[PDB]
mmCIF file of C-alpha atoms in Angstrom:
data_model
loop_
_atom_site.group_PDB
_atom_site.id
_atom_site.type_symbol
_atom_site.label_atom_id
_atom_site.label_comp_id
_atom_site.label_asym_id
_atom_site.label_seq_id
_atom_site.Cartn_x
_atom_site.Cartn_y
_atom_site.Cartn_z
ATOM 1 C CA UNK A 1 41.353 -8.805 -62.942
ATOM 2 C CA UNK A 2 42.599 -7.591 -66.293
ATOM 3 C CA UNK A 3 46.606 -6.585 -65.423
ATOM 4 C CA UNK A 4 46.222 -7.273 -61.802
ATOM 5 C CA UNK A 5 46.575 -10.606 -59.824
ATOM 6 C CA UNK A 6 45.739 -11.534 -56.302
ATOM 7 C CA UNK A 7 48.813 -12.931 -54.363
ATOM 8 C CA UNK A 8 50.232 -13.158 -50.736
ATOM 9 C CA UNK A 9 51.160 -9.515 -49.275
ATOM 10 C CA UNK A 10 54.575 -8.001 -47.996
ATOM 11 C CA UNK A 11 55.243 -6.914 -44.343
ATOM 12 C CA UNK A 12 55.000 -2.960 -46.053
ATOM 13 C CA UNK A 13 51.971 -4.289 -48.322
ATOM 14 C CA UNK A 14 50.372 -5.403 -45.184
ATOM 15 C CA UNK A 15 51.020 -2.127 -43.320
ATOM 16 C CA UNK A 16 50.135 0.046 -46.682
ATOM 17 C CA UNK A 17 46.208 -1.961 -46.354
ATOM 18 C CA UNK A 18 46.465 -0.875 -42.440
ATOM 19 C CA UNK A 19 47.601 2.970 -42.968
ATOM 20 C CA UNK A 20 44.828 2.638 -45.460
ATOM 21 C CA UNK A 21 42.123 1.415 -43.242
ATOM 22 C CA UNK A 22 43.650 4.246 -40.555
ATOM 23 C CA UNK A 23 43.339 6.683 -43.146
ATOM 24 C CA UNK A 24 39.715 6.459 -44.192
ATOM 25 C CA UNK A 25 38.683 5.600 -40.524
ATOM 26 C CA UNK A 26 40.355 9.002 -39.402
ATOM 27 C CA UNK A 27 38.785 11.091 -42.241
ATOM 28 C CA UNK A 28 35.091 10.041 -41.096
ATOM 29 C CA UNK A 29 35.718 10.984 -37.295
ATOM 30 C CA UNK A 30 35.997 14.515 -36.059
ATOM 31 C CA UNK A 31 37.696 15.779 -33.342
ATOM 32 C CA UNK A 32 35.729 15.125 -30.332
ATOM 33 C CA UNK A 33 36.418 11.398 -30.781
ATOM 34 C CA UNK A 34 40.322 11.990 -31.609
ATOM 35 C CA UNK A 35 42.243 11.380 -27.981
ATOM 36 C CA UNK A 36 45.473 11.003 -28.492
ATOM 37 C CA UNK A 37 46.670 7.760 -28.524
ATOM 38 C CA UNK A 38 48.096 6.220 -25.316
ATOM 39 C CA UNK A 39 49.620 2.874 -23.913
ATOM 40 C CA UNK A 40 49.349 2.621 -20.182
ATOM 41 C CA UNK A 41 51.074 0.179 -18.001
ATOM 42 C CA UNK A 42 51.261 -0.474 -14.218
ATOM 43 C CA UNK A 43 53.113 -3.447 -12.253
ATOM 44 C CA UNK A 44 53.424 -4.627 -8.766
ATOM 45 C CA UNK A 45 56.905 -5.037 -7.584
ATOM 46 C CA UNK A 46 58.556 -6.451 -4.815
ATOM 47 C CA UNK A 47 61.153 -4.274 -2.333
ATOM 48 C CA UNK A 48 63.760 -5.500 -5.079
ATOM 49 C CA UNK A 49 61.827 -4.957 -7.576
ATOM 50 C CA UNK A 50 60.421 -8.226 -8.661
ATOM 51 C CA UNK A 51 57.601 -8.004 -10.568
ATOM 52 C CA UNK A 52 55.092 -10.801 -9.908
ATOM 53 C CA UNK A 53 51.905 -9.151 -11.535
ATOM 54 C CA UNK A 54 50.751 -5.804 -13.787
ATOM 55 C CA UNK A 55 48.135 -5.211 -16.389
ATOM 56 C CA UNK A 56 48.524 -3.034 -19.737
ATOM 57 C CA UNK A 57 46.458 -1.740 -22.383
ATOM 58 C CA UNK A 58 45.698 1.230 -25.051
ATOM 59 C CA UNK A 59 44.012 4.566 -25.489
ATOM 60 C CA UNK A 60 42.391 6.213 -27.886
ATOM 61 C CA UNK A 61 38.490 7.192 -29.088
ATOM 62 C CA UNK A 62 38.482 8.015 -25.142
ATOM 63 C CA UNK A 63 38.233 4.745 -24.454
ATOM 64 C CA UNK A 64 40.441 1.997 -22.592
ATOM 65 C CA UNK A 65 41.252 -1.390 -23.920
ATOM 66 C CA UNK A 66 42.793 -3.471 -21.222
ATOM 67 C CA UNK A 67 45.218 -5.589 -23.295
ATOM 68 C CA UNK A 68 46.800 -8.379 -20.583
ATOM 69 C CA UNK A 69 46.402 -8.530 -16.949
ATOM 70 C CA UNK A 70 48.635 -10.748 -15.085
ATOM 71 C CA UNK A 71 49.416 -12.170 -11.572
ATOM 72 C CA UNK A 72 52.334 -14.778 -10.975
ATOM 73 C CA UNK A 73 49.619 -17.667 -9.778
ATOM 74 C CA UNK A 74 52.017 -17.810 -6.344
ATOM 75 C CA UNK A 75 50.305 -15.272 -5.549
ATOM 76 C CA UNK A 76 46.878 -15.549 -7.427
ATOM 77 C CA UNK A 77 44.995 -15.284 -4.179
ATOM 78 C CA UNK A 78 46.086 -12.222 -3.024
ATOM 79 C CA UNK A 79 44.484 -9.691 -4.610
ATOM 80 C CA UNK A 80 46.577 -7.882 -6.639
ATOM 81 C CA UNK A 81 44.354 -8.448 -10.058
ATOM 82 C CA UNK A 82 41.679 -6.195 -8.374
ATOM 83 C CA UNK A 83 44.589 -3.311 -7.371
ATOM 84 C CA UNK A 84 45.780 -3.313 -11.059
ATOM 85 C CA UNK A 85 42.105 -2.833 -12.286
ATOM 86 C CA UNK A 86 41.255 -0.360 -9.939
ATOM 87 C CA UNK A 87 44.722 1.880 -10.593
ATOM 88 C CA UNK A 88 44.528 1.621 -14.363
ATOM 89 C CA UNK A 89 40.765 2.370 -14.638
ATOM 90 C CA UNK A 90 41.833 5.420 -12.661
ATOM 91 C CA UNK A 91 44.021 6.432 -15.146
ATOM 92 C CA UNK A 92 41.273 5.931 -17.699
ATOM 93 C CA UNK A 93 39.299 8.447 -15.795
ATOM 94 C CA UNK A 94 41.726 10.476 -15.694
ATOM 95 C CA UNK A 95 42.388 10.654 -18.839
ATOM 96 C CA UNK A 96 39.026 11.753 -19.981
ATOM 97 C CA UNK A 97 37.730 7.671 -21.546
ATOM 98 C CA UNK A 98 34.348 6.564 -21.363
ATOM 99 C CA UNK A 99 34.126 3.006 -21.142
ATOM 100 C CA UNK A 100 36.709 0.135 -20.906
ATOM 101 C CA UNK A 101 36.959 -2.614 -23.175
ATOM 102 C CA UNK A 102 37.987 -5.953 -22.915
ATOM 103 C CA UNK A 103 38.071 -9.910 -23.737
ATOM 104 C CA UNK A 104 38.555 -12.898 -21.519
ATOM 105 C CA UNK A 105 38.696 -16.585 -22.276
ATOM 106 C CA UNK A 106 36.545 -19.115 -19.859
ATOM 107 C CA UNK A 107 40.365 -19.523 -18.494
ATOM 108 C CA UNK A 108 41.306 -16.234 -17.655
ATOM 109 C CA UNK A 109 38.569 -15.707 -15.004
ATOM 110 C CA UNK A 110 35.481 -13.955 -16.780
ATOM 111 C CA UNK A 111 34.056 -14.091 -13.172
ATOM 112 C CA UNK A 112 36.777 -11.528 -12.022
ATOM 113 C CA UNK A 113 36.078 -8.487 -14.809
ATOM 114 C CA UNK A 114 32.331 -9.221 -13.567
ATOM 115 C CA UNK A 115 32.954 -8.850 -9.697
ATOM 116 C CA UNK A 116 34.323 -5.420 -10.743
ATOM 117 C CA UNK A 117 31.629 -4.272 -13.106
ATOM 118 C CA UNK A 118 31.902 -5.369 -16.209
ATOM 119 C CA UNK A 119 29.088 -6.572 -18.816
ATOM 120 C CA UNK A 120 29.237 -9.107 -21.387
ATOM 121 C CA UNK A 121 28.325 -7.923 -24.240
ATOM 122 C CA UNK A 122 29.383 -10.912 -26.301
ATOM 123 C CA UNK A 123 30.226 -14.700 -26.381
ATOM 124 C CA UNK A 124 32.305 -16.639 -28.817
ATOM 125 C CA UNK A 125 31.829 -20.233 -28.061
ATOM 126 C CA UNK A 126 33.837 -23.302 -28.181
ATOM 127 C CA UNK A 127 36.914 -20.598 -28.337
ATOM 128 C CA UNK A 128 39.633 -21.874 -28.923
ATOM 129 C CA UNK A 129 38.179 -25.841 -28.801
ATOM 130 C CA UNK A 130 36.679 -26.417 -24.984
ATOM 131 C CA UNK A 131 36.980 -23.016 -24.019
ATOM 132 C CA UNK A 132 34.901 -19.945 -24.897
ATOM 133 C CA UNK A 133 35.576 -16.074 -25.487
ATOM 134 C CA UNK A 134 33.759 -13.504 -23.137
ATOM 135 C CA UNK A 135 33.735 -9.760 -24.178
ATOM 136 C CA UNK A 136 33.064 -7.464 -21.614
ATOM 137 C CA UNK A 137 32.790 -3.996 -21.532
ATOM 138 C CA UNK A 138 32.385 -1.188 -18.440
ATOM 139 C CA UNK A 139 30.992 2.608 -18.754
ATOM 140 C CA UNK A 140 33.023 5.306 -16.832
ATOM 141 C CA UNK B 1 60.090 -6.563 5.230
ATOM 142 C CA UNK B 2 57.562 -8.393 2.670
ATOM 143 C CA UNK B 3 55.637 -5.660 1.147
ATOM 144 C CA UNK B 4 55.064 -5.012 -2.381
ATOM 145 C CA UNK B 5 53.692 -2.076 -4.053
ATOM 146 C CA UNK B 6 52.198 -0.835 -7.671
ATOM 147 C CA UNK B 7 53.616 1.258 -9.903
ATOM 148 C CA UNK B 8 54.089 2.546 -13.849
ATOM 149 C CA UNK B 9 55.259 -0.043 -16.199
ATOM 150 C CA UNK B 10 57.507 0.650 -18.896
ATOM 151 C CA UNK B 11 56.988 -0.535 -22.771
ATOM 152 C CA UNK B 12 59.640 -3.543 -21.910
ATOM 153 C CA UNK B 13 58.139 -4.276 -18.633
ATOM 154 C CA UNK B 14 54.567 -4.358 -20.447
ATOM 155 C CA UNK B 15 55.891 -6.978 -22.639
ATOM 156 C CA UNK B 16 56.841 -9.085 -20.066
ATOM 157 C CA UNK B 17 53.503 -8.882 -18.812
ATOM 158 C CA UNK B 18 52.054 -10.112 -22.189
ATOM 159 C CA UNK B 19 54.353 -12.208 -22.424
ATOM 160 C CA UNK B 20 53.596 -14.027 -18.748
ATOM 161 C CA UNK B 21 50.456 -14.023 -20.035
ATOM 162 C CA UNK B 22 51.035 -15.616 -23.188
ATOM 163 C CA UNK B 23 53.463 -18.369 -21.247
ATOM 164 C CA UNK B 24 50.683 -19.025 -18.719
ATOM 165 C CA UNK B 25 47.930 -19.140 -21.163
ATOM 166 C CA UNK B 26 49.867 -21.892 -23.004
ATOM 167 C CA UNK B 27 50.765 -23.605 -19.966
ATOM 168 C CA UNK B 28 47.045 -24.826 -18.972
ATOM 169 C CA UNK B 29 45.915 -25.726 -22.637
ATOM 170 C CA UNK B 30 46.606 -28.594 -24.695
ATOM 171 C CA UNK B 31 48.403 -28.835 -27.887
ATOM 172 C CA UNK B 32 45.566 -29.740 -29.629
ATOM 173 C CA UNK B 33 44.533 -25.825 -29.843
ATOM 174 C CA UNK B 34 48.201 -24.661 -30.080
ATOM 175 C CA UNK B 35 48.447 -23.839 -33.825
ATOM 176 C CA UNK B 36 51.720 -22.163 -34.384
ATOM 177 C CA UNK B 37 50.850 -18.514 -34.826
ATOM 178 C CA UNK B 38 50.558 -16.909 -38.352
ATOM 179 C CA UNK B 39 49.992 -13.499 -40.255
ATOM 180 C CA UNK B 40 48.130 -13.801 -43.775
ATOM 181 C CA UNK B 41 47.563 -11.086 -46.036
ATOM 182 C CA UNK B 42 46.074 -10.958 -49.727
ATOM 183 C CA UNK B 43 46.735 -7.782 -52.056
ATOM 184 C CA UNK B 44 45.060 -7.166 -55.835
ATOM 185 C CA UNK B 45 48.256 -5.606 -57.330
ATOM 186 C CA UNK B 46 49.348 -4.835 -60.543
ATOM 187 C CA UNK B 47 53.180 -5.501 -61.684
ATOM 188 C CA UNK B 48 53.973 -1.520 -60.865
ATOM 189 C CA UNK B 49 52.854 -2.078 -57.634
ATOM 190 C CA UNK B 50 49.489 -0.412 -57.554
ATOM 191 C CA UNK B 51 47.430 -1.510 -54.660
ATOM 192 C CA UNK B 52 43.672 -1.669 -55.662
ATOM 193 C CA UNK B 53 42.748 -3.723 -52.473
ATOM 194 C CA UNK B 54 44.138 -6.345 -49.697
ATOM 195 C CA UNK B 55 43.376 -7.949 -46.267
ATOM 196 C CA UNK B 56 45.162 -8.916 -43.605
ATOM 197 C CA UNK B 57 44.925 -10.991 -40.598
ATOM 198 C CA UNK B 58 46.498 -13.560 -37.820
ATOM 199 C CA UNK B 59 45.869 -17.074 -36.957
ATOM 200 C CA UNK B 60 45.982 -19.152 -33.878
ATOM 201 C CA UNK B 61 43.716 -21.329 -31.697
ATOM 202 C CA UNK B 62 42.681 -22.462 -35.259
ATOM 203 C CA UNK B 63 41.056 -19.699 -35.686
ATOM 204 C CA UNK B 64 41.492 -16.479 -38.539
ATOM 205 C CA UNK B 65 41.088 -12.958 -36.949
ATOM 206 C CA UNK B 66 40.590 -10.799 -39.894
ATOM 207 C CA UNK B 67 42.673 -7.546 -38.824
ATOM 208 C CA UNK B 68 41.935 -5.289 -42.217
ATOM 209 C CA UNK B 69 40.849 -5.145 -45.285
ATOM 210 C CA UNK B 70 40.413 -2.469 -47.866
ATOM 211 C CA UNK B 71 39.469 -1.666 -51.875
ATOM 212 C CA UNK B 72 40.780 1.678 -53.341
ATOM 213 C CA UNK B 73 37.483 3.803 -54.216
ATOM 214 C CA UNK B 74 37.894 4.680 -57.141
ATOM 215 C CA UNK B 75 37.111 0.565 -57.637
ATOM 216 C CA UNK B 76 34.630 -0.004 -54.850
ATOM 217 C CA UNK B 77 32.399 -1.848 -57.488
ATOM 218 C CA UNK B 78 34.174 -3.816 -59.068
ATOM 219 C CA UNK B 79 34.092 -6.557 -56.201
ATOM 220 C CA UNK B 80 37.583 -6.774 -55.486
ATOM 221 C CA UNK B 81 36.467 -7.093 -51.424
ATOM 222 C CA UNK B 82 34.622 -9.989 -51.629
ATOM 223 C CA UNK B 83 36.891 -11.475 -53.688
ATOM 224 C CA UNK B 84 39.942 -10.964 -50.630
ATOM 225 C CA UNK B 85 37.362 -12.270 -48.118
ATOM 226 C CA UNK B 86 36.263 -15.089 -49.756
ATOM 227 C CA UNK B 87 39.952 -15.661 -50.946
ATOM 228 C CA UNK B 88 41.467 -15.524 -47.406
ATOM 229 C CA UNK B 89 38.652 -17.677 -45.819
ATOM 230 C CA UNK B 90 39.798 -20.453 -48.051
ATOM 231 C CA UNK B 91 43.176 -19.815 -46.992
ATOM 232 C CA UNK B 92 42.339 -20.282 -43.699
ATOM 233 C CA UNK B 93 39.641 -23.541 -43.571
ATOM 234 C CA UNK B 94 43.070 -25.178 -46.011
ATOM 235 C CA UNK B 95 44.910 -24.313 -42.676
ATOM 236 C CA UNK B 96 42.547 -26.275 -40.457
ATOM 237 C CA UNK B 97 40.566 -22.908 -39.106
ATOM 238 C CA UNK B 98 37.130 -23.824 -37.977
ATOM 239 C CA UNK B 99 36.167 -20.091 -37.067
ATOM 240 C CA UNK B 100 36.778 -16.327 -38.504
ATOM 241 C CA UNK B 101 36.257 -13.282 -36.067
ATOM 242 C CA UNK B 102 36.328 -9.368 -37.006
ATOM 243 C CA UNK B 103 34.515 -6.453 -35.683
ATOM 244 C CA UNK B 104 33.756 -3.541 -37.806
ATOM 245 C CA UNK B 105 32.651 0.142 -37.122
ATOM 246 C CA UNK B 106 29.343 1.629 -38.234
ATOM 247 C CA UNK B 107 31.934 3.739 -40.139
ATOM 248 C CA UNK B 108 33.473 0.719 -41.866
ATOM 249 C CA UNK B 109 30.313 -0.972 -43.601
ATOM 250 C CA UNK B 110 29.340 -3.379 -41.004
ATOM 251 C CA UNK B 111 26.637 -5.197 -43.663
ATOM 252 C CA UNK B 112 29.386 -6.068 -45.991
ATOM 253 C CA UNK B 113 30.341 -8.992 -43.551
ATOM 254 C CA UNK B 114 26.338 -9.319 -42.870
ATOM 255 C CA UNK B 115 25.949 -9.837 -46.479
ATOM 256 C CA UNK B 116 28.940 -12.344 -46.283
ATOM 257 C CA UNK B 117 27.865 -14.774 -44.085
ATOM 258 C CA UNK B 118 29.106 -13.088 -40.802
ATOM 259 C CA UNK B 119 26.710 -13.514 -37.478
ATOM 260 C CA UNK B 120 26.905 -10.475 -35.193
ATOM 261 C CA UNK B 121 27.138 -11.728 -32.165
ATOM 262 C CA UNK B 122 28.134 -8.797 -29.779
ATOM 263 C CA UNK B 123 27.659 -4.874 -30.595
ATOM 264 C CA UNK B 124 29.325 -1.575 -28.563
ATOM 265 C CA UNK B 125 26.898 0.859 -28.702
ATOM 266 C CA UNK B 126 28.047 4.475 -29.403
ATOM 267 C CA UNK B 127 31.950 3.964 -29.506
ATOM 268 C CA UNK B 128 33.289 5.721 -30.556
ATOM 269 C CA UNK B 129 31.071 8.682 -29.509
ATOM 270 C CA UNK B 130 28.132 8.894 -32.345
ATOM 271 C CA UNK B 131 29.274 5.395 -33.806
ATOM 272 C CA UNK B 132 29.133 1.847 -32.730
ATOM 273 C CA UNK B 133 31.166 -1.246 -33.061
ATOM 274 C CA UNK B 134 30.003 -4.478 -34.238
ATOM 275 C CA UNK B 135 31.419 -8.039 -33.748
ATOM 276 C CA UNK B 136 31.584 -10.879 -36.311
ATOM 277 C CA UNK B 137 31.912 -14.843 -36.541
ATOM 278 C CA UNK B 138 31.636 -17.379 -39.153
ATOM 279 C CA UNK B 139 31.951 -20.865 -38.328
ATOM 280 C CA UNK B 140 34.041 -22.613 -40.985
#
């Protein structure tokens, strides 16, 4: 620690350790993992364009992380979360990934990601206190 | 005269969706979990600016979600990473966090959080393509 001290970061300090991390990650991978990086999104709208559901998530390493999936709860019966999952894992396809990624707490219906083939591949209990954490993940 | 159909979201409309998420999420838990979300980052500087090393991450749910962290190479021995992890997990049991989750890459030195104290407790296999990703927790 001689001439250097340990203290709380900046917003650009914090993205400098990030490009960082980016950097090093990038310089190990080659090419055939490098798909350019993506956001996809898809909602369900009404004849006026009311929006009571959609799902979004990222791209890259050819693979798809499904960040939120959502359905107004007036209409949480109706099967729209299944339409959303199907469409956007179609774009996945599409788009050349091989497996989907994503998380689900006990609340957010870990049963549904497992009616449409998904696996758990890991738990994190009591997550956040009296819930759990459910990672699942699904090869294209 | 009822019908609704699915299409592509834009970036704002995907924040909405998030952010429905978010709202609803909130809505069926208790305050009790509800700690007020936070970024934390540590860097080892010197008064130029030089960054030899720093980690970042986010709390919430009580919980620390280590995002990055990174040493300069041409240090790599000289400890400074175990130092920033052992400095931020302090950080966050002071703030009432009972848990710490990260994941790392094969890429990324997966044993230096083994080594650490970290449990595996989920693993990707071969994602990206020729790698794998593994997931951490330590219970504070």
């Amino acid at each position: 620690m001689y001439m250097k001290h340990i203290e709380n970061g900046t917003r650009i300090e914090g993205e400098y350790i990030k490009n960082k991390v980016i950097q090093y990650n990038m310089s190990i991978l080659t090419d055939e993992v490098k798909q350019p990086m993506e956001e996809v999104s898809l909602v369900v709208k009404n004849e006026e364009g009311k929006i009571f559901g959609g799902v979004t998530g990222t791209m890259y390493f050819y693979h798809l992380h499904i960040d939120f999936l959502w359905v107004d709860e007036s209409v949480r019966h109706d099967g729209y979360g299944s339409q959303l999952l199907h469409e956007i894992e179609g774009i996945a396809k599409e788009k050349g990934c091989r497996l989907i990624l994503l998380d689900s707490f006990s609340f957010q219906a870990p049963e549904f990601y497992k009616k449409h083939g998904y696996r758990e591949y890991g738990v994190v209990e009591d997550h956040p206190k009296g819930h759990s954490q459910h990672f699942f993940e699904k090869r294209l």
